[PDB]
Structures are given as C-alpha cells and as structure tokens.
Design an enzyme around this catalytic site. Structure first.
Site, PDB file in Angstrom:
ATOM      1  N   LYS A  11       0.853  -1.186   0.000  1.00  0.00           N
ATOM      2  CA  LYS A  11       0.000   0.000   0.000  1.00  0.00           C
ATOM      3  C   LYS A  11       0.889   1.235   0.000  1.00  0.00           C
ATOM      4  CE  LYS A  11      -2.525   0.822   3.599  1.00  0.00           C
ATOM      5  NZ  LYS A  11      -3.661   0.841   4.565  1.00  0.00           N
ATOM      6  N   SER A  32      -2.148   8.908  18.818  1.00  0.00           N
ATOM      7  CA  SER A  32      -2.654   7.800  18.012  1.00  0.00           C
ATOM      8  C   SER A  32      -4.077   7.407  18.396  1.00  0.00           C
ATOM      9  CB  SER A  32      -1.731   6.586  18.140  1.00  0.00           C
ATOM     10  OG  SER A  32      -2.313   5.433  17.559  1.00  0.00           O
ATOM     11  N   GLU A  55      -2.348  14.994   4.188  1.00  0.00           N
ATOM     12  CA  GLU A  55      -2.345  14.217   5.429  1.00  0.00           C
ATOM     13  C   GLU A  55      -1.956  15.019   6.671  1.00  0.00           C
ATOM     14  OE1 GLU A  55      -3.371  11.336   6.298  1.00  0.00           O
ATOM     15  OE2 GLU A  55      -3.933  10.505   4.344  1.00  0.00           O
ATOM     16  N   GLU A  58      -5.087  17.179   7.396  1.00  0.00           N
ATOM     17  CA  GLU A  58      -6.174  16.402   7.983  1.00  0.00           C
ATOM     18  C   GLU A  58      -5.852  15.836   9.372  1.00  0.00           C
ATOM     19  OE1 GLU A  58      -7.226  13.446   5.090  1.00  0.00           O
ATOM     20  OE2 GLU A  58      -8.244  14.874   3.769  1.00  0.00           O
ATOM     21  N   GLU A  59      -4.612  15.396   9.585  1.00  0.00           N
ATOM     22  CA  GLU A  59      -4.259  14.682  10.816  1.00  0.00           C
ATOM     23  C   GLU A  59      -3.630  15.547  11.908  1.00  0.00           C
ATOM     24  OE1 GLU A  59      -4.743  11.480  11.503  1.00  0.00           O
ATOM     25  OE2 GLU A  59      -5.218  10.543   9.573  1.00  0.00           O
ATOM     26  N   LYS A  79       3.341  -4.474   5.023  1.00  0.00           N
ATOM     27  CA  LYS A  79       3.341  -4.303   3.574  1.00  0.00           C
ATOM     28  C   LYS A  79       2.997  -2.851   3.229  1.00  0.00           C
ATOM     29  CE  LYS A  79       3.402  -7.211  -0.293  1.00  0.00           C
ATOM     30  NZ  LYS A  79       3.682  -8.658  -0.535  1.00  0.00           N
ATOM     31  N   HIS A  80       3.759  -1.920   3.802  1.00  0.00           N
ATOM     32  CA  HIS A  80       3.638  -0.492   3.506  1.00  0.00           C
ATOM     33  C   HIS A  80       4.863   0.019   2.750  1.00  0.00           C
ATOM     34  CE1 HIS A  80       0.178  -0.584   5.943  1.00  0.00           C
ATOM     35  NE2 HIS A  80       0.584   0.079   7.008  1.00  0.00           N
ATOM     36  N   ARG A  98      -7.613  14.305  20.231  1.00  0.00           N
ATOM     37  CA  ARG A  98      -6.244  14.123  19.765  1.00  0.00           C
ATOM     38  C   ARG A  98      -5.383  15.343  20.085  1.00  0.00           C
ATOM     39  NH1 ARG A  98      -4.541  12.181  13.763  1.00  0.00           N
ATOM     40  NH2 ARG A  98      -4.124  10.250  14.929  1.00  0.00           N
TER      41      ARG A  98
END
Lengths: 130, 127
Positions: A11, A32, A55, A58-59, A79-80, A98
């Site tokens: 990914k 997190s 990202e 947004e994060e 699998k990154h 957060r």
C-alpha cells in the site's frame, strides 16, 4: 476506490516530519487514535507530495512549506511503502471536531521507540543518514 | 597512571576534533587499518578538559580550542566513564594516520570497527 497499491502489492502512503523552524530541531508529533508521526494512504491520482500535504492538514491541522523527500520507507510487517517528506510549519489550526506537541528531535525518538520504532527510523535517518 | 571514581569506574576522556566551527568534518586516526576517535585514561590530578586536550595532542598531534562537554559516556562492558568533548582544530604537527571525514561517513566507518566511538558522533548529531 481511495487506496492505492504498487505492482508488488504494497500500500502506498505518505508522511511528513513537520518542523518548527528551518533548523529542524523541533518536530511536531500527534496522538494515536502514544505518539506518532502524521501520515496516511495515498489516493489514486495523488502525487506523493500532494498526499503528504493533505495528510498533515487532515491529521495534525497544519499548513506549511513542503521540502525535500527524505526517502521511501518500507514496512514489511505491514506491507507499507511510505514517502516521507520534511515540511516547515507556518500555521496551526482550531479545535477540530487528539493532541499535538513539539518534541526536541532526541526526545521524539525516545517516545517513538516505545511502540512505533519505524517512525523513529524516519528521524534517525534524517539526522544520522543512519 | 590510571584513576577511578567511587563506583569503581575508570575515568577517561576523548575528543571530537572538527575542521571548522561548522562541525561537519571530523578528524579520525589509526589504531590495525582501523579508525578511532582519539582518547585515553585521565591522570590522577587532571580535570577532564585537561585530559582531553593532552590526549588529542598525544594521539592525533593537534592543538585547538576546547569547546563543550558533549556528555559522559558509560561503558559497562569495560567499566569506563568517558568525558567526550568537542574541539576546533587550529594547528596540526608533523606510521600512524590521520584523515578528515564528513560526519555522516565517520559514523558509518566507526560503526564497523569501533561502534562505541560511533555513539559519540551519533549523539552529537541527534542533539
């Protein structure tokens, strides 16, 4: 379809090391769901730099000046493949709907080595070239 | 002679010698076709800074301006405590070798033959 993959089945993701100044001594980390480096999946038509900028917005609710590509970091347990950029922060935002805090680089590595060592690797390679 | 603290550790001093105030090129010396950071034991009446300056003279044949104490590095495999300073080289003197390394390359070459010395430079760069 909002996720994207390469020909080997990894990914595709993007992340940024967000710094307070051009001296790259203080990096911004976030909560997190423990601390993490902000990042996430690339969308189907996005360039990696575009994904990275979206990202961190947004994060971490930040805007800034996108800098150089540090590298592509491969996580084989998950699998990154993650494109990691540096960015200089210019604006932080609101209250959302957060936590976020600045860490001295040495401090960031210590807290990340607890439960998320691949993120720690980003910072190590930046400063040491490992 | 050698000198010890109250917990039985041997006291040592070493220095990271740089070409400029920019701290980008560091001086290493041969031990072996092996590279090391210059250093050695502290003498009974010496202050750590004094030991450091004496050691870079004796081991790398340089003189310079002593800078900050990077830290005290404890080696428990050998029961050492080493005061590591930075220094800016001002004068060199002339089969032991000396060469300038870019810091990133120095970390790589030391991680193969002397990894405890590599930590000196690593901690410098993370700081």
């Amino acid at each position: 379809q909002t996720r994207t993959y390469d020909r080997e089945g990894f990914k595709k993701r993007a992340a940024c090391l967000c710094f307070r100044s051009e001296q790259e001594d203080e990096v911004l980390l976030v909560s997190s769901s423990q601390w993490i480096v902000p990042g996430g999946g690339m969308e189907p038509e996005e360039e990696p730099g575009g994904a990275a900028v979206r990202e961190v917005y947004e994060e971490a609710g930040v805007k800034g000046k996108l800098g150089r590509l540090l590298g592509i970091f491969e996580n084989q347990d998950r699998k990154h493949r993650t494109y990691v950029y540096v960015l200089t922060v210019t604006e932080i935002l609101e209250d959302w709907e957060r936590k976020r805090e600045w860490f001295k680089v040495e401090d960031a590595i210590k807290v990340l080595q607890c439960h998320k060592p691949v993120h720690a690797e980003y910072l190590e390679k930046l400063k040491l070239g490992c």
